[PDB]
Amino acid sequence: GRLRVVVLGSTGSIGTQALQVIADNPDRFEVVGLAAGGAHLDTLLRQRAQTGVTNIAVADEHAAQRVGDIPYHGSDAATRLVEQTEADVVLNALVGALGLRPTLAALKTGARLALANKESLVAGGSLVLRAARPGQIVPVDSEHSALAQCLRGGTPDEVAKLVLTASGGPFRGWSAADLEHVTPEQAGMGPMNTLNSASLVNKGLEVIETHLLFGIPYDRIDVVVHPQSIIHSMVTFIDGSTIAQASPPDMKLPISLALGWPRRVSGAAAACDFHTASSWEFEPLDTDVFPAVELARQAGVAGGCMTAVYNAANEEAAAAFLAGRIGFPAIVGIIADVLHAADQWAVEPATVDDVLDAQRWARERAQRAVSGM
Amino acid sequence: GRLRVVVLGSTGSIGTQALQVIADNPDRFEVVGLAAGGAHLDTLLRQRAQTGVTNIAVADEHAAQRVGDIPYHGSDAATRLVEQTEADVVLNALVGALGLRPTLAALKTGARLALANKESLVAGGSLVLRAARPGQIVPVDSEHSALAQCLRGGTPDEVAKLVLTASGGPFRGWSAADLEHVTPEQAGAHPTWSMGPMNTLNSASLVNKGLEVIETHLLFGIPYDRIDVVVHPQSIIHSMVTFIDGSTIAQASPPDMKLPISLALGWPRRVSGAAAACDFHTASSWEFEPLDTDVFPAVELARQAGVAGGCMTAVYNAANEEAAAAFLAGRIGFPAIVGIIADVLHAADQWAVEPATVDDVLDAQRWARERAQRAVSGM
Ligand SMILES: NC(=O)C1=CN([C@@H]2O[C@H](COP(=O)(O)OP(=O)(O)OC[C@H]3O[C@@H](n4cnc5c(N)ncnc54)[C@H](OP(=O)(O)O)[C@@H]3O)[C@@H](O)[C@H]2O)C=CC1
Ligand SMILES: NC(=O)C1=CN([C@@H]2O[C@H](COP(=O)(O)OP(=O)(O)OC[C@H]3O[C@@H](n4cnc5c(N)ncnc54)[C@H](OP(=O)(O)O)[C@@H]3O)[C@@H](O)[C@H]2O)C=CC1
Ligand SMILES: O=CN(O)CC[C@@H](c1ccc(Cl)c(Cl)c1)P(=O)(O)O
Ligand SMILES: [Mn+2]
Ligand SMILES: [Mn+2]
């Protein structure tokens, strides 16, 4: 009665926490596949020995060579592993839009896709949705996990609004002028999600992720700043009732629920402790200073390949910021500049190649924007 | 479709708010019966005129004699109306032990019972539960309505804890020394236009929360040691459920009883536009703090009564009513209320037997009142 789990991005934060959840629950879960990029071979070798899984994908050819005997190696390794491994659940914890092909392959096998890699859904859009049956994608992202639990509070016709909470990042309350001086070390889960959290681009991706997972119109997806990150998101129903999910921050909770959906996993995470005092605070997002969420809505409403453009433009601008080439406020400046030139990408993708064409265009246009700074 | 609703206690706060919800939602609800005590006969008669409902009951015979065309009047008027009226939902918003029999009659008809009357569960206990079938009782009060909604977040087997919120009352965070000085006025403990002095006093003493803990155990079948109370002064979070994985599901709304009332009436279906939703356009905070059980032992005493079972919760509540009355009359200090409940309960083990009849419940209450009177007077 064990679920067979493929873990993509096994050596990262989410991947190792997932392996820990699986280790703690041998009656429910069994690891049958691992994929990693090759930057952390030490961790990967330990994972092979501990799980006893030799069914492994390594993206970097040289790193795979150095290990020896890796059955899937090279840029398509993770995808081929998914295509050729019998599984009940695929956990996609890869980072970036490179998770796109493994997401599509996972869905095509019929397995539950436990999705941490929000970018593959954001980029893929209707192409990823067409590949999925209803409920096949189960969110690992903490907010979306919370939304899915809260939606149990009523029927679909009773949903008024979905309320996505945001930490606000380290620069919550900072002025536009304050942001000009943000260093990479200040804006630094992995380096991409840490940065995306600080810039609010993560929240923008999550608005798009919300629309795609739950089919709710953009004008019914609210974002509220909640610095404590105890409330992970909420749903407001048509009678005025709001149902919210709360827990001390710990990704093992949403990971555990996504792997075993619909069944909750005993002891996954610590519960809220109401025997000590606390406060849960809410404030509006300053959209003038942090316009990334609004840009995401604009990209989402345009639809088609525009969400792929939004993400791809961020990936390049973020890389440039982390390399010390542009200032912090330039990240979202570049995204806006790219999106506003992106007329032709409103068309719905027919194939993966359409998405890849949009991203290719977006990366080039982002470089052009960087070149002008 | 359209639900046929009998409103018991039509002239009180819950009843009149329910009639507003019904007036606003004629496609979903129709009134087919009204019952009141008689103290507000003029209101009931206006309700008859406004709704066109002639199927009415008045408990007080003197009051009934002012009219001449009431079909149900006298001692068990509300019960007889319930027994003889075809209905989908019975809202029981009667006050005190005279809500118990109509609850029992309503359960026997096979109608859904939207329950506000606290005495039905607190005093009636196993009498009521043995009469009820799964899902038949739908709770009207904000905490229990919150729990019912949050329980949708998992299966029964996935529940770790039920967590009730408490406002903390006017003396939130006060010390034992502070409490010695409390006056009836300070406890808000006088008649107001809609509510009696017991409501704010029970809130202030934490006895109300004790009562809600007992009802929680009986409604949802969770052991007392897994029913927690947290102080939340804003009353925006109405209660929460903690599941076995560490996830907590909470229900939140600006205070407005029309929400839990609308949901009790239409259960399982939500009533569009019943109440205003939480608004996050302006900064706010939701605060939580523990209750000092040494200063406020009312909830612990409720658990003690609840665990003992039988008629012990009837004893808890009747001792409070008497102790509370003594405080209101200057006969005892504020901290002595819960002191007297404790003294009565510890002498009450004969009442741990399950009640067979309404009269068994009434006898327990009679005994508890007398015992409380002795404790107050020192006799
Ligand atoms: N971490 C968190 O708390 C949260 C994460 N998420 C999402 O989950 C996903 C991952 O999160 P996170 O664990 O922090 O990311 P990490 O940086 O921690 O790890 C990313 C994983 O992907 C692998 N990887 C990177 N590049 C490639 C590639 N080209 N081919 C194959 N594999 C590759 C890495 O292997 P290696 O490093 O050994 O090369 C690594 O195991 C992200 O999309 C993120 O948005 C969402 C919410 C919270
Ligand atoms: N008020 C609230 O917000 C809350 C209510 N509840 C519970 O719901 C129940 C009712 O609340 P509430 O509406 O405020 O009570 P109210 O005092 O406001 O009104 C109660 C109703 O009961 C009727 N009644 C009174 N005496 C008798 C009698 N001797 N025989 C028959 N009927 C009688 C009254 O008719 P008449 O006026 O003519 O005598 C009245 O319509 C209580 O048990 C309470 O604990 C729980 C939490 C909160
Ligand atoms: O799902 C989580 N993320 O995507 C990380 C980014 C968000 C975040 C940050 C800190 C904590 Cl403690 C938590 Cl719980 C969540 P965001 O900053 O996007 O709300
Ligand atoms: Mn997230
Ligand atoms: Mn209450």
Explain what this protein looks like in three dimensions.
Two copies of one chain form a homodimer. With 373 residues, chain A is α/β, with parallel strands linked by helices. Chain A has three domains: 1-141, Rossmann fold; 142-286, no CATH class; 287-373, Rna Polymerase Sigma Factor, Chain: A (Orthogonal Bundle), CATH 1.10.1740. Chain A is 44% helix and 16% strand. The first copy, chain A, contains 16 helices and twelve strands. The first copy, chain A, has a seven-stranded parallel sheet with strand order 4-3-2-1-5-6-7, sandwiched between helices. In chain A, helix 14 (306-322) crosses helix 16. The longest helix of chain A has 20 residues, at 352-371. The relative contact order of chain A is 0.12. Strand 12 of chain A pairs antiparallel with strand 12 of chain B. The structure holds NADPH dihydro-nicotinamide-adenine-dinucleotide phosphate (2 copies), the ligand O=CN(O)CC[C@@H](c1ccc(Cl)c(Cl)c1)P(=O)(O)O and manganese (II) ion (MN) (2 copies). Residues 141-143, 206 of chain A line the site of one manganese (II) ion.
Order of helices and strands of chain A: EHEHEHEHEHEHHEHEHHHEEEHEHHHH
Instruction: Supply the number of helical segments of chain A.
Output: 16
Give the strand tally of chain A.
12
The side-by-side strand order for the widest beta sheet of chain A comes to: 4-3-2-1-5-6-7
- Assign the structural class of chain A, choosing from mainly alpha, mainly beta, alpha/beta, alpha+beta, or little secondary structure: alpha/beta
What is the helix fraction of residues of chain A, given as a range? 40-55%
Which chains have the largest interface? A-B, 50 and 50 residues
Oligomer: homodimer
PDB class: oxidoreductase
Keywords: oxidoreductase, doxp/MEP pathway
Assembly: dimeric
Entry title: X-ray structure of 1-deoxy-D-xylulose 5-phosphate reductoisomerase, DXR, Rv2870c, from Mycobacterium tuberculosis, in complex with a 3,4- dichlorophenyl-substituted fosmidomycin analogue, manganese and NADPH.
